[PDB]
Design a protein around this ligand. Structure first.
Ligand SMILES: [Zn+2]
Ligand SMILES: [Zn+2]
Lengths: 170, 370, 550
């Protein structure tokens, strides 16, 4: 009746194993790295990031919020929140060997443009991946942090004698 | 429009009301250039809590895996118009997901032009093409004499849009695609990337020749790390930058705490002597003031004897003991790790003190007795 | 001694009109709102306690109108009566309202009512019936089983969470998330009760398989405040889990480190190190998400101020801690440094990680002279396949103390024929974003200054005005720091240090700057085990006397 299958049920077995590993708390990202060396070791030495980053954007339906509202979510927002955070950490780790076309489709989801109740950690890891590609200078105040934190940190640094270095260039 | 008198026309044109009292609609519903048969009978009043909705078997097989959602939406949805909007949205999703089974290209542009372009390339290059003609894969050679592949994935419109290019080598590959460009264009870009990355390949090939590389085995071309072995029961891992390979790498040491310390010390003291005009090996040998072994054991190189969940030996006294009943996996585990793993999976079933499940790596029956 | 009633008499009506809404908190919204406002209620009660304490009962009618109703509503709400000291203060207030010698019957009724509410607080059986019957039969009172009962409820719930966690995607009873959120609301008032920490630790470790959070951020804010004030003492796995599922709690932790270096413990780097090590941030910053967020905040601060020595020294300390935690607990499967420091060439970091404890004191020069080469290449030859810019190479180079600070002290040792690469490094340290035309002028100024200082050192013990001449711009902090290193190094010092310090310390900012310099220098020496006791005692005395002037 109320049995729910795992949202990585229909995926390629190695991807399934990776997403099973990342589930496991803060040691999820290290375990993701161990998984990738344990597939470099096996018969399929390459790992199909380009297939996983399509599956991460593929949409399926859910009914959340009120009793009745149909909405379409991608995988990245449908799989467990610690799998999410340890994913994006692992994509920071292996960014150079990833296709940009897939990454940008992922980062657009992570940005969560026009959503209530966002994931601050997903948005922040989005920003930190954009900055590392070099397509998210963005000409904004788009920083990983909150406006609250950035303001409370201006408020304290104001109470300190500014240094003779010149790092901002007017 | 607001009312369901013109908004319904504009958003489902091929639904014709049979009856005067607009209660029986019949006809076709559109989704991604495809019309599906549909007959949607209401009761005497305007209520969807109970209604009939029959389909063609094409549409039923295409709405496989969403029947519950549609049934729920029939009861939850106020109006017919919004139900049709949701149904079109859902169809678009189903088709875009199962894009494999549902498609047809425009041959007069497609099938001929791709063969024309592959002839423009030369038929010594191409090595693979899929029966849907979606995937193709091409080959090229280095001046050093190395084979390097490039996978393309093509859409219904190949020349209109960019084709998805998948390539092994580690730096992100950038291909300026125009609608006027073609396979020779992207192939020239591929050869350009090859001749650029020549130096990195040379370094990693020299390592793979003259050292007992340990834990990548048959490494890909994307890999920048190479855990080299030296002496006995100590190794050094080495990550290399493609743009600046000959420059100093991030490097460190695994093994015995009493053996490793002088190596870190000697590295710290000699690290200023690195020079990016020689080779990595020819710099490492005079930095660490040692020579390497060339496959001191080539058969029993190493079998990772760790938990295969936590990747550690010695979790809280426990040892890797629980293994796979399989010749191809043989992967050890711990009781605790494997219990926490198997208690999750849906396949697993627990008797009194026994859990049967699938081995994580190979998905074969594995038994755990607590 | 101005108002004495008005603000308190307003807050009174506020609180009584809030208690009446709350009313035993048998729902979600009452519970959340209580969990928000309870702290201010505690302070309100302290002020009310002072007010009723200084005066006496039954004579005065200031707030005696509804004080009864207030203290009752407080008492029958258990989210209040389980917060830190709220129960103790409500007891105090009821003790103040009592009277020894009642005269009118109303005061006797009051005293009876006070005994009643006190009895409700301490000793009423508002629990399941049969357990009270059974215990009363066996001759056990509530005080000699409630502890074990609590203990057993807590273990039960904690096991249940663990089993709902292990049963991820399995055909079994799923702990309803209403219950998990309920427990998370209950943990908030009684976070400082030792008899509940298992339930906290279990809630943090047992994230489970949901896409949304089931706990609400009041839980996380509560736990974090308690972790940082040392009132709960969890293990490290749980505070990492906390950071890593509530990002504002990790920002709020890193701010609580900045108050310690801005306000409280300016230039007591031993105390900064003690706070950092007791905190879990080094251990937690081995997850790259957390190291990236931490460096982003360090960056914001390096920029708001224009290169504050206090933030610089704090970063150096943090980085040392983080390194000696990464080494400890990154044996198998460790992340590559370009994952923590992604904005630079890995070569440079792999040089700068190498500690100078490991190297002889004489071979520091060669290593610095090599680092200068790599920074110069990375800045000046800014071509594709390199750093993002000069600021990035600087911000890295600053993370690794020892090297950045040792520069001047090696210039003085080689002041005869100064190395141009060290001059370059020093000018880079005290100013990036300058350009070669500026850098050359800076370096030649420094070279002339080194000539004069070497002349003065190889001369006898001379005045302070001869030094103030060369001290007399865009290169002032550099010359100040170089001159301080001259004082500590040369044996001509420990005689005329005061004469120069007094002249240089015009303002308080220069005083703070010199204090920071000297604390950093002693931390550095005591760490590397390099010391001349003359310079140690000299610097300690100057620091002691200047910390009074500020
Ligand atoms: Zn294990
Ligand atoms: Zn197996």
């Amino acid at each position: 009746e109320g049995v729910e299958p795992a949202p990585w049920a229909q995926l390629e077995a190695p991807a399934r194993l990776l997403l099973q590993a990342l589930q496991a708390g803060p040691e999820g990202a290290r375990r993701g790295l161990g998984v990738l060396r344990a597939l470099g070791s096996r018969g399929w030495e390459p790992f199909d990031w380009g297939r996983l980053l399509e599956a991460l954007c593929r949409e399926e339906p859910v009914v959340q919020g009120p009793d009745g509202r149909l909405e379409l979510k991608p995988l990245l927002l449908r799989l467990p929140r610690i799998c999410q955070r340890n994913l994006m950490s692992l994509l920071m780790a292996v960014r150079p060997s990833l296709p940009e076309s897939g990454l940008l489709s992922v980062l657009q989801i992570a940005q969560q443009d026009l959503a209530p109740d966002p994931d601050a950690w997903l948005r922040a890891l989005g920003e930190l991946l954009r900055r590392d590609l070099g397509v998210g200078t963005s000409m904004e105040g788009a920083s990983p942090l909150s406006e609250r934190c950035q303001r409370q940190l201006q408020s304290l640094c104001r109470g300190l004698g500014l240094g003779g270095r010149r790092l901002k260039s007017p | 429009m607001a009312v369901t008198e013109a908004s319904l026309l504009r958003q489902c044109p091929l639904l014709l009301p049979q009856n005067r009292s607009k209660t029986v609609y019949e006809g076709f519903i559109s989704a991604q250039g495809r019309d599906f048969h549909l007959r949607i009978v209401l009761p005497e009043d305007l209520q969807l809590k109970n209604a009939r909705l029959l389909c063609s078997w094409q549409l039923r097989t295409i709405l496989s895996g969403y029947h519950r959602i549609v049934q729920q939406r029939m009861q939850h949805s106020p109006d017919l118009m919004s139900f049709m909007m949701e149904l079109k949205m859902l169809l678009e999703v189903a088709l875009k997901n199962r894009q494999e089974l549902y498609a047809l290209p425009p041959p007069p542009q497609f099938y001929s032009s791709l063969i024309e372009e592959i002839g423009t390339l030369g038929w010594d290059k191409l090595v693979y093409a899929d029966t849907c003609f979606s995937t193709i894969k091409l080959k090229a050679e280095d001046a050093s004499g190395r084979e390097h592949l490039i996978t393309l994935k093509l859409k219904a419109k190949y020349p209109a849009e960019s084709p998805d290019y998948f390539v092994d080598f580690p730096v992100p590959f950038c291909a300026s695609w125009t609608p006027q460009s073609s396979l020779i264009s992207i192939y020239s870009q591929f050869l350009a990337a090859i001749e650029s990355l020549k130096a990195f390949w040379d370094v990693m090939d020299e390592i793979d020749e003259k050292t007992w590389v340990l834990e990548p085995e048959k490494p890909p071309r994307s890999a920048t790390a190479r855990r080299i072995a030296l002496g006995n029961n100590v190794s050094i891992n080495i990550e290399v930058d493609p743009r600046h390979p000959t420059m100093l790498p991030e490097c460190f040491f695994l093994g015995a705490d009493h053996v490793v310390k002088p190596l870190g010390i000697k590295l710290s003291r000699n690290i200023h002597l690195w020079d990016p005009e020689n080779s990595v090996l020819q710099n490492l040998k005079d930095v660490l003031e040692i020579d390497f072994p060339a496959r001191a054991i080539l058969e029993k190189s190493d079998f990772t004897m760790d938990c295969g969940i936590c990747y550690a030996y010695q979790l809280d006294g426990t040892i890797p003991d629980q293994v796979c009943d399989n010749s191809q996996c043989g992967q050890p585990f711990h009781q605790i790790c494997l219990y926490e793993w198997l208690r999750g999976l849906l396949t697993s079933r627990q008797s009194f003190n026994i859990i049967f499940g699938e081995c994580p790596y190979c998905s074969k029956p594995i038994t755990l007795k607590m | 001694m101005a108002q004495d009633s008005v603000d308190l008499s307003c807050d009174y009506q506020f609180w009584m009109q809030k208690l009446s809404v709350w009313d035993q908190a048998s729902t979600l919204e009452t519970q959340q709102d209580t969990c928000l406002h309870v702290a201010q209620f505690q302070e309100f009660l302290r002020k009310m306690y002072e007010a009723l304490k200084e005066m006496d009962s039954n004579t005065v009618i200031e707030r005696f109108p509804t004080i009864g109703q207030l203290l009752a509503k407080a008492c029958w709400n258990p989210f209040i009566l389980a917060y830190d000291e709220s129960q103790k203060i409500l007891i105090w207030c009821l003790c103040c309202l009592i009277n020894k010698e009642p005269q009118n019957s109303g005061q006797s009724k009051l005293n009876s009512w006070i005994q009643g509410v006190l009895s409700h607080i301490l000793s009423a059986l508002r629990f399941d019936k049969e357990v009270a019957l059974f215990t009363q039969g066996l001759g056990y009172a509530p005080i000699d089983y409630y502890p074990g009962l609590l203990k057993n409820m807590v273990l039960s719930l904690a096991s249940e969470l663990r089993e709902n966690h292990l049963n991820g995607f399995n055909t079994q009873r799923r702990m309803a998330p209403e219950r998990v959120a309920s427990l998370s609301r209950v943990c908030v008032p009684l976070i400082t009760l030792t008899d509940v920490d298992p339930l906290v630790e279990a809630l943090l470790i047992c994230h489970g398989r949901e896409p949304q959070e089931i706990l609400q951020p009041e839980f996380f804010e509560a736990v974090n405040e308690a972790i940082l004030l040392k009132k709960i003492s969890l293990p490290m796995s749980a505070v990492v889990c906390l950071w890593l599922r509530h990002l504002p709690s990790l920002e709020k932790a890193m701010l609580h480190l900045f108050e310690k270096l801005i306000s409280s413990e300016r230039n007591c780097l031993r105390r900064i190190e003690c706070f950092i090590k007791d905190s879990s941030l080094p251990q937690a910053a081995c997850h790259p998400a957390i190291f990236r967020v931490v460096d982003e905040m360090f960056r914001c601060a390096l920029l708001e101020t224009d290169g504050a020595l206090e933030i610089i020294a704090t970063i150096q300390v943090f980085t040392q801690c983080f390194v000696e935690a990464l080494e400890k607990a990154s044996k198998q499967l460790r992340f590559a440094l370009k994952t923590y420091f992604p904005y630079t060439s890995p070569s440079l970091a792999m040089v700068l990680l190498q500690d100078p404890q490991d190297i002889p004191r004489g071979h520091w020069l060669q290593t610095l002279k090599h680092i200068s080469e790599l920074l110069r290449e990375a800045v000046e030859d800014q071509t594709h396949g390199s750093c993002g810019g000069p600021f990035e190479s600087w911000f890295l180079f600053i993370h690794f103390g020892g090297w950045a600070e040792m520069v001047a002290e090696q210039l003085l040792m080689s002041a005869a024929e100064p190395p141009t690469a060290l001059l370059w490094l020093l000018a880079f340290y005290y100013g990036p974003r300058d350009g070669r035309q500026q850098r050359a002028q800076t370096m030649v100024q420094v070279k002339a200054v080194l000539g004069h200082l070497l002349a003065m050192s190889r001369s006898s013990s001379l005045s302070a005005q001869d030094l103030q001449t060369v001290a007399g711009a865009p290169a002032q902090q550099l010359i100040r720091h170089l001159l301080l290193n001259f004082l500590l190094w040369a044996p001509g010092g420990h005689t005329i240090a005061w004469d120069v310090i007094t002249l240089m310390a015009h303002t308080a900012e220069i005083t703070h700057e010199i204090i920071g310099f000297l604390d950093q220098t002693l931390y550095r020496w005591n760490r590397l085990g390099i010391e001349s006791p003359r310079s140690e005692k000299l610097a300690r005395e100057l620091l002691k006397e200047l910390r009074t002037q500020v």
